[PDB]
Design a protein around this ligand. Structure first.
Ligand code: HEM
Ligand code: HEM
Ligand code: HEM
Ligand code: HEM
Lengths: 140, 143, 140, 143
């Protein structure tokens, strides 16, 4: 459950992510595929090398999904219901993997916005991504 | 931890650039801010109310410097992490009753701190090497 | 995130828990203190023996809190805000322990209502207690 | 796993009464219903849509009998759980890539099944002993 303050911190921090979101989500996917290789089993149909176009476009998709998750942060379960229906019904992604991707997102936001990673912004984005992970793994 | 030559050279090369006095209390303080139940284990450190009270706390800086002391000692002994971390696993398991998952949390926070202090220098292969090192340390303390 | 159907299963299951609630929560606390002894560190001021009156009355409070959470299953953060303020701010309970207590609750509901533990009722109560655990470990 | 004489006698006496043919597929089936991502690992078992399709599935019953075979073999070897479970840990880690936390989940589901089949006979000390056994099996497979 998010407070008012961490909703402020997530909307501000991701609002300053902004137009770099596609390369940040693509970098986060390359960090997940490289540091946590078991997640590669969810993508047998991608080309998973560095600088791939399909990991780039998929990271654009993941980043836009997080963008309108920030936009509907008070009512995430009906805004992410199609993606919950994808990741929970069809794909059956282990929630551990979500933690992994969330961590890699944070590492990307650590490596590109050091003026924005306050510890409070870190806690805010962490429990935000835990809320998104709780929505997408849930089946409803 | 099994590493490549290039992963040990990357971990060694980036770890030589690490401000121990800063990265220690940075990682322990972000552990206390992001994961607040861990503050129960550090109730004798004083005021832990706000994030600016945790990051401005000298016992958090001192103890975080101890924690990076144990991480650097684990980097000098990557083939012997269970022999390095038997007294510390004894302490964190019996005397302190810290849950094993918490160790993983601290390690992930440490990796975020490294990215926060190295930026583009903290490439995805460098994160991959520090992730399997960090998982080696957490699995060496959970024993 | 709960569906409509698992809200139906949780409201029915605890509706048939009913007046045995303090018994079941006290037994669940004895199962947690006995199988998971590290949780005893949160209660240095109780008498933690079997058949204790203080574990009994505390299990009555835990079970009435869960009955209140079933009654307000669609706005659990607004209903459990005092208990979130207790378990998250003052006590600062590791969420692992919540999983432990949730498991012991399920074991109690397995040992006393076998006609009610359908696997669907099991999945429903598991996601319910995970939602209550997510509420009580977070700050507002 | 360190157990008392009374805990091994309680686990042995409670486990001799266990219908393997039911408790196996019911523990694996409740694993697939309560924790649905685990169904990804069993996609070759057929229809796993509803809980009555998972409980009405003969490959879930047969494979659950295999899983309780491994649990009874772990009960005959409580001092040697890592030696009993090296081939199965090799299988579940390398070939299947099952996360270690999932093992804990199945073990907890098994304990619920035991309570569901023994009622008041599944006392809190019997649960405490089966929790140490179950945690020993999950920590023996996570290696
Ligand atoms: C944490 C937040 C996540 C978000 C916001 C997210 C978002 C998305 C989006 C937008 C899509 C594309 C949907 C479409 O094109 O139809 C997608 C598909 C997918 N996601 Fe995620 N995802 C997340 C986490 C994960 C994780 C952790 C995994 C696995 C380890 C994963 C595995 C997949 C797969 C396999 C697909 C299908 C790819 C394809 O159809 O080509 N996702 N997700
Ligand atoms: C994962 C890597 C970790 C490392 C390398 C590490 C390192 C250390 C070291 C070297 C000490 C000894 C301090 C001394 O003897 O003076 C220590 C003590 C301690 N550790 Fe950790 N630790 C880790 C994780 C944790 C976590 C995750 C927690 C709690 C959430 C924790 C809680 C404590 C506490 C409470 C002490 C005693 C300090 C005191 O009471 O003032 N440790 N740790
Ligand atoms: C579904 C989970 C839980 C619920 C509904 C719950 C509910 C409650 C309630 C109603 C109280 C009494 C509040 C009061 O009297 O002021 C309480 C207090 C408390 N709870 Fe829980 N609780 C849960 C889980 C836990 C867990 C998992 C732990 C620790 C392992 C825990 C530790 C405590 C402690 C230490 C107290 C203070 C009791 C005292 O000081 O006498 N709770 N909780
Ligand atoms: C304490 C926990 C567990 C025990 C004792 C156990 C035991 C076993 C045994 C005896 C086999 C048969 C190996 C063979 O026939 O060669 C097996 C296979 C398998 N296990 Fe488990 N298992 C456990 C947990 C899990 C979990 C939690 C999952 C998945 C979420 C899982 C997934 C599988 C799969 C996919 C197979 C291969 C079966 C097939 O492909 O048809 N296991 N396990």
């Amino acid at each position: 459950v998010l407070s008012p303050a961490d909703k402020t911190n997530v909307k501000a921090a991701w609002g300053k992510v902004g137009a770099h979101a596609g390369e940040y989500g693509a970098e986060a996917l390359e960090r997940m595929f490289l540091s946590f290789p078991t997640t590669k089993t969810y993508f047998p149909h991608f080309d998973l090398s560095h600088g791939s176009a399909q990991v780039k476009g998929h990271g654009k998709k993941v980043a836009d999904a997080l963008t309108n998750a920030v936009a509907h942060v008070d009512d995430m379960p009906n805004a992410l219901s199609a993606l919950s229906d994808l990741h929970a019904h069809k794909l059956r992604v282990d929630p551990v993997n979500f933690k992994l991707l969330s961590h890699c997102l944070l590492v990307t936001l650590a490596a590109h916005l050091p003026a924005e990673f306050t510890p409070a912004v870190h806690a805010s984005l962490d429990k935000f991504l835990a809320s998104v992970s709780t929505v997408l793994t849930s089946k409803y | 931890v099994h590493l490549t030559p290039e992963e040990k050279s990357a971990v060694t090369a980036l770890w030589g650039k690490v401000n121990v006095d800063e990265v220690g209390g940075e990682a322990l303080g972000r552990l206390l801010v992001v994961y607040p139940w861990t503050q129960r284990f550090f109730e004798s450190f004083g005021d832990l109310s706000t994030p600016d009270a945790v990051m401005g706390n000298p016992k958090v800086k001192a103890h975080g410097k101890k924690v990076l002391g144990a991480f650097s000692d684990g980097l000098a002994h990557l083939d012997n992490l269970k022999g390095t971390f038997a007294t510390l696993s004894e302490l964190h398991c019996d005397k302190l009753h810290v849950d094993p998952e918490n160790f993983r949390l601290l390690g992930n926070v440490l990796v975020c701190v490294l990215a926060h202090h190295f930026g583009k220098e903290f490439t995805p292969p460098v994160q991959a090497a520090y992730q399997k090192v960090v998982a080696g340390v957490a699995n060496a303390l959970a024993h």
